[PDB]
Design a protein around this ligand. Sequence first.
Ligand code: ZN
Ligand code: ZN
Ligand code: ZN
Ligand code: ZN
Lengths: 80, 80
Amino acid sequence: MKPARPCLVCSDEASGCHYGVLTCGSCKVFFKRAVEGQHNYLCAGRNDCIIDKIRRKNCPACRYRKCLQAGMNLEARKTK
Amino acid sequence: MKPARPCLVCSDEASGCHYGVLTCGSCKVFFKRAVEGQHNYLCAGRNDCIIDKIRRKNCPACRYRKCLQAGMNLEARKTK
DNA sequence: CCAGAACATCGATGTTCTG
DNA sequence: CCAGAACATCGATGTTCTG
Ligand SMILES: [Zn+2]
Ligand SMILES: [Zn+2]
Ligand SMILES: [Zn+2]
Ligand SMILES: [Zn+2]
Protein backbone atom coordinates (compact mmCIF):
# COMPACT_ATOMS: atom_id res chain seq x y z
CA MET A 1 0.00 0.00 0.00
CA LYS A 2 1.33 3.14 -1.50
CA PRO A 3 1.71 6.57 -0.12
CA ALA A 4 -0.74 8.38 -2.34
CA ARG A 5 0.76 10.35 -5.30
CA PRO A 6 -2.39 12.44 -5.73
CA CYS A 7 -4.09 13.62 -8.92
CA LEU A 8 -4.44 17.47 -8.67
CA VAL A 9 -8.07 17.36 -9.76
CA CYS A 10 -9.54 14.45 -7.66
CA SER A 11 -7.07 13.29 -5.00
CA ASP A 12 -7.00 9.68 -6.41
CA GLU A 13 -3.63 8.05 -7.33
CA ALA A 14 -2.00 10.10 -10.05
CA SER A 15 -0.58 8.21 -13.01
CA GLY A 16 1.81 10.67 -14.78
CA CYS A 17 1.65 14.16 -16.27
CA HIS A 18 -1.57 14.21 -18.36
CA TYR A 19 -2.30 17.33 -20.36
CA GLY A 20 0.03 19.39 -18.18
CA VAL A 21 -0.78 18.31 -14.63
CA LEU A 22 -0.34 15.29 -12.45
CA THR A 23 -3.61 13.31 -12.71
CA CYS A 24 -5.06 9.81 -12.50
CA GLY A 25 -6.13 8.15 -15.74
CA SER A 26 -9.84 9.07 -15.47
CA CYS A 27 -9.37 12.89 -15.45
CA LYS A 28 -7.10 12.49 -18.46
CA VAL A 29 -9.89 10.83 -20.51
CA PHE A 30 -12.56 12.97 -18.85
CA PHE A 31 -10.73 16.14 -19.86
CA LYS A 32 -9.87 14.89 -23.32
CA ARG A 33 -13.64 13.98 -23.77
CA ALA A 34 -14.75 17.33 -22.27
CA VAL A 35 -12.68 19.76 -24.33
CA GLU A 36 -13.25 18.14 -27.66
CA GLY A 37 -17.04 18.51 -27.51
CA GLN A 38 -20.15 19.83 -25.69
CA HIS A 39 -19.39 20.49 -22.07
CA ASN A 40 -22.70 22.39 -21.58
CA TYR A 41 -23.52 20.61 -18.23
CA LEU A 42 -25.12 22.21 -15.18
CA CYS A 43 -24.36 22.08 -11.52
CA ALA A 44 -27.06 20.68 -9.23
CA GLY A 45 -25.53 22.80 -6.31
CA ARG A 46 -23.66 26.08 -5.88
CA ASN A 47 -20.78 25.66 -8.46
CA ASP A 48 -18.32 24.33 -5.82
CA CYS A 49 -18.96 20.58 -5.19
CA ILE A 50 -16.36 18.45 -3.41
CA ILE A 51 -14.62 15.81 -5.50
CA ASP A 52 -12.88 12.61 -4.55
CA LYS A 53 -12.57 9.15 -5.95
CA ILE A 54 -16.40 8.58 -5.56
CA ARG A 55 -17.87 11.97 -6.23
CA ARG A 56 -16.06 12.97 -9.43
CA LYS A 57 -18.93 11.28 -11.18
CA ASN A 58 -21.63 13.40 -9.51
CA CYS A 59 -20.77 16.77 -11.10
CA PRO A 60 -19.16 16.94 -14.55
CA ALA A 61 -19.53 20.72 -14.40
CA CYS A 62 -17.34 21.21 -11.33
CA ARG A 63 -14.92 18.57 -12.57
CA TYR A 64 -14.40 20.49 -15.80
CA ARG A 65 -13.77 23.67 -13.81
CA LYS A 66 -11.21 21.87 -11.60
CA CYS A 67 -9.31 20.68 -14.75
CA LEU A 68 -9.13 24.23 -16.18
CA GLN A 69 -8.17 25.79 -12.78
CA ALA A 70 -5.44 23.12 -12.35
CA GLY A 71 -4.02 24.03 -15.81
CA MET A 72 -4.98 21.11 -18.14
CA ASN A 73 -4.51 22.12 -21.84
CA LEU A 74 -4.36 19.92 -24.97
CA GLU A 75 -1.20 20.98 -26.80
CA ALA A 76 0.84 20.75 -23.62
CA ARG A 77 3.20 17.92 -22.65
CA LYS A 78 3.41 18.58 -26.24
CA THR A 79 3.86 20.72 -29.20
CA LYS A 80 3.92 24.35 -30.15
CA MET B 1 -55.40 24.03 -5.79
CA LYS B 2 -52.42 21.79 -6.81
CA PRO B 3 -49.82 21.02 -9.51
CA ALA B 4 -51.09 17.97 -11.40
CA ARG B 5 -49.29 17.24 -14.69
CA PRO B 6 -45.59 17.12 -13.57
CA CYS B 7 -43.40 14.92 -11.36
CA LEU B 8 -43.24 15.88 -7.70
CA VAL B 9 -39.59 14.87 -7.67
CA CYS B 10 -37.90 16.12 -10.89
CA SER B 11 -40.64 18.05 -12.64
CA ASP B 12 -40.78 15.68 -15.65
CA GLU B 13 -44.30 14.81 -16.90
CA ALA B 14 -45.88 12.32 -14.47
CA SER B 15 -47.13 8.87 -15.64
CA GLY B 16 -49.74 8.25 -12.92
CA CYS B 17 -49.76 8.08 -9.09
CA HIS B 18 -46.80 5.80 -8.15
CA TYR B 19 -46.10 4.68 -4.53
CA GLY B 20 -48.11 7.52 -3.11
CA VAL B 21 -47.25 10.56 -5.32
CA LEU B 22 -47.85 11.92 -8.81
CA THR B 23 -44.61 10.87 -10.61
CA CYS B 24 -42.70 9.76 -13.70
CA GLY B 25 -41.56 6.44 -15.06
CA SER B 26 -38.02 6.95 -13.46
CA CYS B 27 -38.61 8.21 -9.98
CA LYS B 28 -41.02 5.29 -9.61
CA VAL B 29 -38.34 2.70 -10.50
CA PHE B 30 -35.60 4.69 -8.79
CA PHE B 31 -37.59 4.77 -5.58
CA LYS B 32 -38.08 0.99 -5.35
CA ARG B 33 -34.45 0.46 -6.36
CA ALA B 34 -33.28 2.92 -3.62
CA VAL B 35 -34.94 1.22 -0.61
CA GLU B 36 -34.35 -2.39 -1.64
CA GLY B 37 -30.81 -2.29 -3.11
CA GLN B 38 -27.63 -1.54 -1.14
CA HIS B 39 -25.79 1.48 -2.63
CA ASN B 40 -23.31 4.36 -2.17
CA TYR B 41 -25.05 7.69 -2.67
CA LEU B 42 -22.95 10.62 -1.41
CA CYS B 43 -23.89 14.27 -1.82
CA ALA B 44 -21.02 16.36 -3.19
CA GLY B 45 -22.61 19.68 -2.09
CA ARG B 46 -24.66 20.47 1.05
CA ASN B 47 -27.59 17.96 0.94
CA ASP B 48 -29.86 20.31 -1.05
CA CYS B 49 -29.23 19.91 -4.82
CA ILE B 50 -31.83 20.88 -7.44
CA ILE B 51 -33.20 17.52 -8.71
CA ASP B 52 -34.80 17.98 -12.20
CA LYS B 53 -35.23 16.38 -15.52
CA ILE B 54 -31.45 16.61 -16.11
CA ARG B 55 -29.67 17.14 -12.75
CA ARG B 56 -31.41 14.12 -11.30
CA LYS B 57 -28.74 11.72 -12.32
CA ASN B 58 -26.17 13.98 -10.59
CA CYS B 59 -27.09 13.43 -7.01
CA PRO B 60 -29.11 10.29 -6.40
CA ALA B 61 -28.74 10.85 -2.64
CA CYS B 62 -30.73 14.03 -2.98
CA ARG B 63 -33.19 12.32 -5.35
CA TYR B 64 -33.85 9.67 -2.71
CA ARG B 65 -34.35 12.28 0.06
CA LYS B 66 -36.72 14.29 -2.24
CA CYS B 67 -38.75 11.09 -2.77
CA LEU B 68 -39.15 10.56 1.06
CA GLN B 69 -39.96 14.30 1.64
CA ALA B 70 -42.66 14.14 -1.08
CA GLY B 71 -44.64 11.21 0.30
CA MET B 72 -43.43 8.09 -1.67
CA ASN B 73 -44.10 4.89 0.37
CA LEU B 74 -43.63 1.23 -0.69
CA GLU B 75 -46.78 -0.44 0.88
CA ALA B 76 -49.01 2.27 -0.68
CA ARG B 77 -51.86 1.20 -2.95
CA LYS B 78 -53.55 1.42 -6.37
CA THR B 79 -56.73 2.26 -8.32
CA LYS B 80 -57.69 5.73 -9.64
C1' DC C 1 -55.39 1.58 -13.80
C1' DC C 2 -51.19 0.32 -11.29
C1' DA C 3 -46.72 -2.61 -9.59
C1' DG C 4 -43.10 -4.82 -11.27
C1' DA C 5 -40.28 -7.32 -14.77
C1' DA C 6 -37.87 -7.10 -18.71
C1' DC C 7 -35.37 -4.74 -22.45
C1' DA C 8 -32.43 -1.63 -23.67
C1' DT C 9 -29.36 2.41 -23.23
C1' DC C 10 -25.78 5.58 -20.61
C1' DG C 11 -20.93 6.31 -19.40
C1' DA C 12 -17.10 5.84 -16.32
C1' DT C 13 -13.20 3.12 -15.91
C1' DG C 14 -9.26 -0.14 -16.86
C1' DT C 15 -6.44 -2.54 -20.09
C1' DT C 16 -3.12 -3.15 -23.72
C1' DC C 17 -1.01 -1.22 -27.84
C1' DT C 18 1.16 1.78 -31.06
C1' DG C 19 4.18 5.68 -32.48
C1' DC D 1 7.31 8.69 -21.28
C1' DC D 2 2.75 10.63 -22.92
C1' DA D 3 -1.24 10.79 -26.31
C1' DG D 4 -4.95 8.51 -27.74
C1' DA D 5 -7.36 4.50 -30.09
C1' DA D 6 -9.39 0.36 -29.43
C1' DC D 7 -12.27 -2.99 -26.68
C1' DA D 8 -13.78 -4.91 -22.14
C1' DT D 9 -16.95 -5.02 -18.13
C1' DC D 10 -19.59 -2.78 -14.97
C1' DG D 11 -23.05 -0.01 -12.03
C1' DA D 12 -26.58 3.23 -12.48
C1' DT D 13 -30.61 4.53 -15.18
C1' DG D 14 -35.00 4.55 -17.88
C1' DT D 15 -38.80 2.83 -21.07
C1' DT D 16 -42.34 -0.62 -22.69
C1' DC D 17 -44.41 -4.32 -21.34
C1' DT D 18 -47.48 -7.95 -19.02
C1' DG D 19 -50.11 -9.26 -15.85
ZN1 ZN E 1 -8.31 12.38 -11.06
ZN1 ZN F 1 -21.15 21.02 -9.04
ZN1 ZN G 1 -39.46 12.16 -11.80
ZN1 ZN H 1 -26.88 16.46 -3.27
